[PDB]
Each structure stands twice: as structure tokens, then as C-alpha cells.
């Protein structure tokens, strides 16, 4: 199927306490593989996946230099935005960045991403054509015009179509035993009485990868969308994910309810019942 | 692999 590579960046200014904290992480699909934290002793880009450790020291020096330069660029970006928005130098402000590429099963570029946010809302983003910018306000239009004169999009387009795709397929091959091995969810249904005629049916999905999955409850074949409680997909802590869905059913009508699990690691969607 | 670019706001 399709695959993706992503780099996330967060800069949080702490005025009066030193330089802003800079945390950046790299993801291939839903797998973390690189990280960098400015608050470390001597900060360097560090591996977080086994298939990325085989890269030489020239790889890790380059990724560390780029991480440090991104941190400095965000520092002076945060100072610049204080002038654009006429804000005080005493408050804390957040700068978020994300870029990366999506490829299909053939290994070709599906779409390129690069977008920035300031204080939780969109700031400026690279359009799908990898040539024009979308600015969220007149402050970001200042940045847009400078980036257009500096041809920033031309470097981003060349990277997203070139190095981003070439190195993504390299990561996917070196870690094919984990990045491409589907991990179907282990599923079951629990039952908890609430009163003398109301009970809960919870449908579990545990230890699956990737995180994309669908959990639906059906009564007599009818979809119970509005009557279903659904929790956010959560990480188990071992690169797998968990999720469950619950519905309140009348005591005695439990077998009329079916759970439907749709995951890419499953050959066919599962249909589960209470089954005491 | 990260991109190597300096694009100040």
C-alpha cells in the first residue's frame, strides 16, 4: 500500500528562562525513528527504530547540524512574529512545523507537504502543486512574499519530489520486516452489567499496526453510529495501537449486536458478537 | 533524510 515520511518540529519560547525549547521527531508511516531535543546535555539526532541505526556517522552529523539550524531559525522566527503581531516579549509562544511526502505502492510521489503554525493555528503552507503558498493572514503574507522572492518553494519541491521519495523507499526496504509487515488486531468483546436491564458491550482491538482501524457496532445489521461510544486510538508503548467501542444494550438483546473491525492487517473485516 | 534549508519568516 501507500507509505509516508514526516518530520515534526515544535519550538516553545520561554522568555527569561533561556532559549526556546526545540523538539523534532521523524516518522515513517506510524513508526518513530529519529528525534532531537535541545534540552539534552549535548544534543544530537538519535535513532528510535532498529532499521535506522545502520546509517553512518556522516548521516547523524548531517541530521544533527540540520536540527540545530532549524532550532536557530525557529528562534529568530519567534522573534520576528512578535513584531508581525505586535506582541510582548514576555509571553510564551509556540511555533509548529511539519513537512514530508506520501508515496503510493509503486514508489512515486502522491503529494508533498510543508506547513507552519503559530500559537496553534495555521500560518503558511505549501500547496499541493509545490509552487504556491497559502497564507492565513496579512502577517503570513509578509512571509509569503519573501519566500516567493527567495524561491523557497523551488527547493522544497525539489526535495519532496527527490530526496524525500528516494530516502523513504530506502527506509522501507531496510526495515521491511517491520515497516511492511501487517499486524492485525487481536480482538474480543467484554460485557459489564449496569443495572437490572442495561449492560455495556465493549469491543476491543489490541496490538495492531498501523493505527488506522474502524470499529462499528451494529444492531440487527443497522449501524449504531449515534449510540456508540468511541475512544481515540492510543499507542500501547511498543509501536502497536489500541482502541475500543462500547454500546449500552438491553439485558437479553445482547446477541442482536455485532461488532465490525476493519483493519489492513485483516484479510476480511471481522464480525464479532458477545458470545458468553 | 531531512531537508537542508534556511527560510526565515
Amino acid at each position, epitope marked *: 500500500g501507500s507509505h509516508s515520511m514526516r518530520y515534526f518540529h515544535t519550538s516553545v519560547s520561554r522568555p527569561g528562562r533561556g532559549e526556546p525549547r526545540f523538539i523534532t521527531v521523524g516518522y515513517v508511516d506510524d513508526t518513530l525513528f529519529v528525534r532531537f531535543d535541545s534540552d539534552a546535555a549535548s544534543p544530537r539526532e538519535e535513532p528510535r527504530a532498529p532499521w535506522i541505526e545502520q546509517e553512518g556517522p556522516e548521516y547523524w552529523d548531517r541530521e544533527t547540524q540540520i536540527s*540545530k539550524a532549524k532550532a536557530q531559525t525557529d528562534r529568530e522566527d519567534l522573534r520576528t512574529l512578535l513584531r508581525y503581531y505586535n506582541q510582548s516579549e514576555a509571553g510564551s509562544h509556540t511555533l509548529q512545523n511539519m513537512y514530508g511526502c506520501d508515496v503510493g505502492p509503486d514508489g512515486r510521489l502522491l503529494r508533498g507537504y510543508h506547513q507552519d503554525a503559530y500559537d496553534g493555528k495555521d500560518y503558511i503552507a505549501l500547496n499541493e502543486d509545490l509552487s504556491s503558498w497559502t497564507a492565513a493572514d496579512t502577517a503570513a503574507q509578509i512571509t509569503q512574499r519573501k519566500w516567493e522572492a527567495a524561491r523557497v518553494a523551488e*527547493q522544497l519541491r*525539489a526535495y519532496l519530489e527527490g530526496e524525500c521519495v528516494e530516502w523513504l523507499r530506502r527506509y522501507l526496504e531496510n526495515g521491511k520486516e517491520t515497516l511492511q509487515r501487517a499486524d492485525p488486531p487481536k480482538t474480543h468483546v467484554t460485557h459489564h452489567p449496569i443495572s437490572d436491564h442495561e449492560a455495556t458491550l465493549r469491543c476491543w482491538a489490541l496490538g495492531f499496526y498501523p493505527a488506522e482501524i474502524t470499529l462499528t457496532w451494529q444492531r440487527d445489521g443497522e449501524d449504531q453510529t449515534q449510540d456508540t461510544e468511541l475512544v481515540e486510538t492510543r499507542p500501547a508503548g511498543d509501536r502497536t495501537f489500541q482502541k475500543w467501542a462500547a454500546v449500552v444494550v438491553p439485558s437479553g438483546e445482547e446477541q442482536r449486536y455485532t461488532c465490525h473491525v476493519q483493519h489492513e492487517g485483516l484479510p476480511k473485516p471481522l464480525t464479532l458478537r458477545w458470545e458468553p | 533524510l531531512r531537508v*537542508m*534549508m534556511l527560510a526565515p519568516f
Partner: T-cell receptor
Amino acid sequence: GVTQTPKHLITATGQRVTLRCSPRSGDLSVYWYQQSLDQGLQFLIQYYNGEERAKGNILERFSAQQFPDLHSELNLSSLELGDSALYFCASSVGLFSTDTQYFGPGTRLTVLE
Amino acid sequence: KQEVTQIPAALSVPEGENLVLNCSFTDSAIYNLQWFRQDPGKGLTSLLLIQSSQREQTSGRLNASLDKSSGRSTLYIAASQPGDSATYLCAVLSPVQETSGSRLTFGEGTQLTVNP
């Protein structure tokens, strides 16, 4: 575009000269380069909005500065015969890695005994 | 450590000939590579700027490639004219030490003479 003064300069050893540069209107960073016969075009120092940003193999007897109006000066003191070269000034919009630099005409310096 | 070498030192050719100008650099972690021309009297004029991730740029009769992993770049000048007579300088923008202070490093150049 970028202008430099003076265009030519003949000086003796041990003397001191100051070279001046006005960058393009709107550019915030200025650069200084030395083009010699033995070393070619060599980067000296860069300022950004009055603040030093990068530094090459500049000697301690060379001194530069960028003023609030963005124009820049370069002092060359204790001149030696090897200081005879073309000193170029350049400027750019700011701290981008994807744009070029714009160079002035240059200042030819000749140092005699 | 970053240093740039160009070949040939000089070049005297008949007009209309396709030209091949080579450039090598020792450090591959570059922000961009550029080709300048310097005419005696005027300073430098940027002809091409190849972005970090680009492999070629084109402007008129000029066409230059880039190979970071190999540390090589070739400028192609098609249908050379006497007006192209100048020194052609190869340059790379890159950081030198562990700082974001990027510097421009220049090669010695290729003095080109196109004879009518």
C-alpha cells in the same frame, strides 16, 4: 545596486584605510570578500542588521561594522604588501539559503613599501 | 575544509562552440551551488543558482548540473558568443563548522575567451 567607495587606493605599508559599501535598498545582510592572486575570492565577514553573522579567515587587524542605515565600513590596518587585492562588497535580503548575493563593483587596493 | 576546484584554468575557443566547464567541491552538505561571471571592471553577476535538492538549472543558453554525493557540477554553455568572454566562478553555500553561519566558497575560476 550595491556601490562601493573608493574605487581605487594607493597606500604605503603600516597605514590604515577604510572601505565603504552601501547595500541594495531593502537588503539587511552585507558581506565582504577579498580576491587575491594566490587565494582567489575569499570570504571575510558577514553582518545582518548591524550584527555579525558569519566570519571567514579574517585577520585581527581587519575591522568591519554595519550601521543602522545598513551601509557598512571595513578598516584595513597595518597594511602589508600581501593586502593588495580587490575587496568586494555583497548584500542579500536576509538569512535565506535559497537566494543569491549581489556584488558591488569592488575596491582595488595597492600597498607599496 | 570546504574548497572548490575548477578545470580548465583558461579556455580559448571559436564562437558557436558548445562549452563544458567543470567544478568540484569536497563537502557535500551544501545549501546551494551557483555559477557567477566576473567581467574586469564590474563585480560578479549570478548566472545560475542550483537549490540543495535540485539536480539541474537552466537559463537561456546556460545549463548546469549538480551531484552532491559526487561533489561535481558542470556548466554547459551552448552556442558560445564573444559576449560570453569572462571568468566563470563556481561557488557553494555551506556551513563550515558546527554553526548555522553559512559561507560562500569560490573556486579559482575559468577565464573564457570566445574568438569571433
